[PDB]
């Protein structure tokens, strides 16, 4: 119930759907080299070789394990355009309108933040974006969020963040930020210190 | 005595190999293709227009291969990498100094020509290479050492006292086979067989110790 000038909306989870593309795509490796992961639910994920490989731990180089998986990866990169949400667009287009600033924070490295907004004709929604791997911090520090409020020139009490995980949550409570997450119907991410849950980013435009 | 300092550009001057990589791999995905079972080392500083064959593997006969190559490569060009922003931050010092030294200096990439240029523009780089040359312009693909065999003659110099800074295992085959001593900055992130260079490099500024 007060002016909103700048939106903040994390990457995974709030524009892009991955949890389980990356929980399925470890999963397929895994499923190569003959290594079931049934024993682990995504929820698990929400430094894991003993765990994943359990009984056969002592069977497997982890090294030449981890330097396949990461090859793995490079050779399946996420599928940004068939993993957004469908209103994205939508959304980011009608905050613009309305004459918002716009931030985009991401955990994920520059270059696949890069790829993200390149593929889906993001890049001129956002006036400052972010990526995690140029802090020494982590969620649930603040300091992204911080950051971003200082580069938007947006008091905290102004802005909006739009979150899901439980760490990514706090990080934008502990910038004294309102938060609001995308609700977690799936994989049991603990929510209950947003201000509200959101089940879409249609939403998001009932805030402002 | 070194007379000439050959650079390729993707991962030398540019920290694009990544963003290559994955615009490639991208692509493939959209277009249903897997590529599991090639390593990275397979594309990096190669040429996708004549490997469809071990992309496509049995698939081949069922896919328009020239209009996929067409289509990739319209890819590349609606998708640029940003090159302002990839730089490597010691690229200028180091072409200066080496420039300064009196030496020639060629630059040669895998990318396409409109790609080498661009980069070259947006940097301000264009007033420090002898010569440039795109594998665009090259049959023969490396790691096939034509590109640099080409790079040697329109630099006038001889193998024997010129340098090339190099990254891929393609791109450090295709150096050694123009018999030309190869320098690479070094892989931590793509698994690929450097040993082939004379050494390797932690940041181009490692360069100016070779001269």
Known sequence: ???????????????????????????????????????????????????????????????????????????????????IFPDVLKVLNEVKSQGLEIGLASSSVKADIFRALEENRLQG???????????????????????????????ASRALIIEDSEKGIAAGVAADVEVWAIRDNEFGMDQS???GLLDSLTDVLDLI
């Not at 069977?59 to 490079?74: G, P, R």
């Not at 956002?126 to 008091?155: C, H, M, R, W």
């Open 125 to 155: 929604f956002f006036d400052i974006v972010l990526s995690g791997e140029e802090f020494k911090e982590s969620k649930p520090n603040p300091e992204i969020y911080l950051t971003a409020l200082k580069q938007l020139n947006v008091q």
């Open 1 to 83: 119930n007060a002016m909103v000038e700048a939106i903040i909306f994390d990457m995974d989870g709030v524009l892009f759907d991955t949890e389980k593309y990356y929980y399925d795509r470890r999963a397929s490796f895994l499923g190569q080299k003959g290594i079931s992961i049934d024993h682990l639910p995504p929820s698990f994920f929400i430094q894991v070789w003993e765990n994943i490989l359990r009984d056969e731990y002592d069977k497997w180089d982890v090294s030449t394990l981890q330097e396949e998986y990461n090859t793995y990866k490079q050779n399946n990169p996420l599928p940004y355009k068939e993993l």
């Open 193 to 195: 210190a947003a201000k």
